Amino acid sequence: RVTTVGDLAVLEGRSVMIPCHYGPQYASYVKYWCRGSVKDLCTSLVRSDAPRKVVMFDDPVQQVFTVTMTELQKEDSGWYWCGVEVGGVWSADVTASLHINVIQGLSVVNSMVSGEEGTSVTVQCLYSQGYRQHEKRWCRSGDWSSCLVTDGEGRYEDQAVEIRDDLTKAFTVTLKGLARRDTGWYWCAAGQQQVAVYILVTPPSH
């Protein structure tokens, strides 16, 4: 038995850390990480016996080997396999697949953010590598003229809203003091890509 996580979606430029868990029989065998939709036609990318891009760490005591793939590119999308190198065992017992979809655009940590009127909330907008140099914007849905846009230093600030772009992976939008009219749909956006975020402002408490 070899098992791993379910299919993944990751923004271009980010890394993944994949556990390949295996049964206690397989502690002593070489572990490998394979790419291809068809196990019998796959290409080995890294092995646990390599002499001393992708990193492998087999931990027999925890009965898992961990595969790290860094700086993923869109062309890295596809099927991958955890494998144990052992002869004379059913291939299904010593391999496990998963699909990695490397995406270009934006995503959001939490697409529903709520807070009491008069308090502050933060939205964390994530973006893939191709948007590092784009101005970032926060817009109210339905209102083109409402966008608040970062400057050349990745910054926007007025009385109500601050945007801080870390210039590599994410920009945060801080709504500094919610009013109940702020409830509704918004966009994190860069270039022609966007991700929807809902803000729910709840009543002030006694």
Author numbering: 1 to 52, 61 to 214
How do the authors describe this structure?
Protection is conferred largely through the function of the polymeric Immunoglobulin receptor (pIgR), which transports and stabilizes secretory antibodies and also functions as an innate immune factor. The transport cycle of pIgR starts when pIgR at the basolateral membrane binds dIgA or pIgM, and the resulting complex is transcytosed to the apical surface where proteases cleave the pIgR ectodomain (now referred to as secretory component, SC), releasing it into the mucosa as a complex with dIgA or pIgM. SC specifically protects secretory Ig from proteolytic degradation and confers innate recognition functions upon SIgA and SIgM, allowing them to bind and exclude bacteria. Here we report the first crystal structures of intact SC proteins, comparing the highly-evolved five-domain human SC (hSC) and a two-domain teleost fish SC (tSC), a relative of the first vertebrate SC ancestor.
